[PDB]
Every structure is written in structure tokens, then in C-alpha cells.
């Protein structure tokens, strides 16, 4: 799911050719605003991961009786930096970053049971008070019979860190996307960069046009169904009674 940054910039030359970002007026060649370009591309990737799933992750929490709040932050995760004031209870899973948890989706115990999320008055309900924290009531401990939990959630990739010495290559950086959403990302970036420039009648609408094309492309990807989509088929026949 990777692409060389080199190809991205070479192609974005073909749509940013009007403006400062990439071209000297004479002998059009890429400038050194590459930091700003990368900062825009990362935002584009995050937006695409918002619009389509494209990824999902997994954790494994080791419970502790009498605990009320379990935050999911990269200081509690094994292999991260062990801040002394916190016990590292997240013992397994994808490495956690600043933007990794877009939404928690499933909670599965060690017994194979499936608990309920934000479904009030359900038997064993788990509540998220702050979108990245699990609030576990005492009734859960009363009737839990589970020593660990498994969490699944919608992911977004962690962008690679650029550096002033890394300005040498900038071509070994790898964006994390399939190629389809690359074609869409081009329009996103072009719109964002071209918006605040131009004072002529037809040159004042390029940002708007690129936004329109971006939306159209997103709709086309949805229609072609080039993203993950689970579809549920329960049993309903093994409860005992529907047969």
C-alpha cells in the first residue's frame, strides 16, 4: 500500500505547473518548498482514510480489577516509552501513534464473547467517555470471567518524519495508500494549493473546479467499491428455537 514520494511529486508537477510551488518561470524545476508539500500530502492521506476504511487495527488490554478508566495512548503501550507514573497494560498490537484511533468498533473477550459498545441498558455495556478511553463499570468485574480484551478500530497511518538532513533524498519517503486513492489525492492537493491565488475571471475558479472533481472521484470510488466492506450474516438458527 506504498508509493514513492518521487512519483507523487513528478505527477503533481503536471497540475501545479501554473504556480510557485514547483516551477521556476524559466526551466521549470521543483523548488524547495517540499516541506510544505509533504505537510499538505499528509493531511490529504488522513482525509482519505476518514472517507474510506482502507485499514483496521488490533490491541490487547490486560485487565486490572477495580480500575475505572483505561485510556488508549502511546504511553501505556508495550514497546513505547515507559512513563513511570503509568503501568504499561497494552501488551500487544499495532504501534500506537498520535492519530491512529479513528473509532473503536469491536470488543472481544478471551472467551469469544462480544461485548456491547455505547448501547445503554445492555447487559455488559462499555462506555467511551472521551473517544479514546474505555470506562468499565463494576458490574463488568462482577460478571466478567475474562482476564483480557481485544479491541479493533479504524486506523490511519503514521506519517514518516522528514528531517533537514533528509532533505537530500526526500524520494525514499513512502506514502501509505493504494494507487486509486492516489488518483484522488492528486485532486485534493491541487485544490488546496491552488485556492488562494489568482485574480482573473477564469483563473479565480481553479480551486473550486478541483474541489468538484475531487468529490466526483470520491463518488466514483464508492460506486466501484474499491474499499473494505464487511456484510453481516448472522446464524439465528443456533439459539435454540428457530428451527
Amino acid at each position: 500500500t506504498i508509493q514513492l514520494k518521487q512519483v507523487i511529486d513528478l505527477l503533481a508537477e503536471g497540475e501545479l505547473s501554473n504556480i510557485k510551488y514547483v516551477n521556476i518561470d524559466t526551466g521549470a524545476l521543483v523548488l524547495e518548498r517540499v516541506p510544505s508539500l509533504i505537510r499538505a500530502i499528509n493531511l490529504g492521506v488522513l482525509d482519505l482514510h476518514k472517507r474510506f476504511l482502507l485499514k483496521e487495527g488490533m490491541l490487547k488490554i490486560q485487565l486490572e480489577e477495580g480500575r475505572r478508566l483505561y485510556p488508549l495512548r502511546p504511553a501505556y503501550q508495550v514497546g513505547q516509552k515507559p512513563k513511570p507514573g503509568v503501568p504499561q497494560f497494552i501488551t500487544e498490537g499495532n504501534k500506537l501513534g498520535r492519530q491512529s484511533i479513528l473509532k473503536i468498533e469491536k470488543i472481544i473477550g478471551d472467551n469469544g464473547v462480544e461485548y456491547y459498545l455505547n448501547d445503554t441498558w445492555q447487559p455488559l455495556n462499555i462506555t467511551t467517555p472521551e473517544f479514546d478511553v474505555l470506562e468499565i463499570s463494576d458490574e463488568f468485574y462482577c460478571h466478567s470471567s475474562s482476564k483480557t480484551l481485544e479491541v479493533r478500530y479504524r486506523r490511519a497511518p503514521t506519517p514518516m518524519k522528514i528531517c533537514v538532513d533528509n532533505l537530500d533524498s526526500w524520494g525514499c519517503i513512502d506514502i501509505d495508500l493504494p494507487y486509486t486513492h492516489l488518483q484522488a489525492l492528486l485532486y485534493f492537493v491541487a485544490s488546496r494549493c491552488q485556492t488562494p491565488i489568482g485574480f482573473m475571471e477564469n483563473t479565480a475558479q481553479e480551486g473550486f473546479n478541483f474541489s468538484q472533481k475531487y468529490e466526483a472521484e470520491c463518488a466514483n470510488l464508492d460506486a466501484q467499491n474499491l474499499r473494505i466492506d464487511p456484510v453481516g450474516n448472522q446464524d439465528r438458527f443456533t439459539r435454540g428455537g428457530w428451527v
Binding site: A223, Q224, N225, D229, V231, G232, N233
Partner: protein
Amino acid sequence: DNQRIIGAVTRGMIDTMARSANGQVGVMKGALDVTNRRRFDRGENYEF
């Protein structure tokens, strides 16, 4: 004459019922993608 007429009418009704397209199912193009088309053929739930 009666035998001929009855035979003709019966043959007409048989032809109408037989040369029809009973049993075939038609789907609008572009309503289902490839994966959903396969699910629909398989016989499970799908999306349109």
C-alpha cells in the same frame, strides 16, 4: 370446423406460454459492482 378451431386456439395458447422468457432473471447494468454481484449470485446478503 369446431375441431379445427379448438386445435388452433390451444396451439396458440401453448405457443404464448412456451416461447416466453419464464425462468430467466435480468439485472440492470451498473446497479451492482463485481463483489456485490458475486454475493448476490452466491445467495447471501449484499449491497446495491
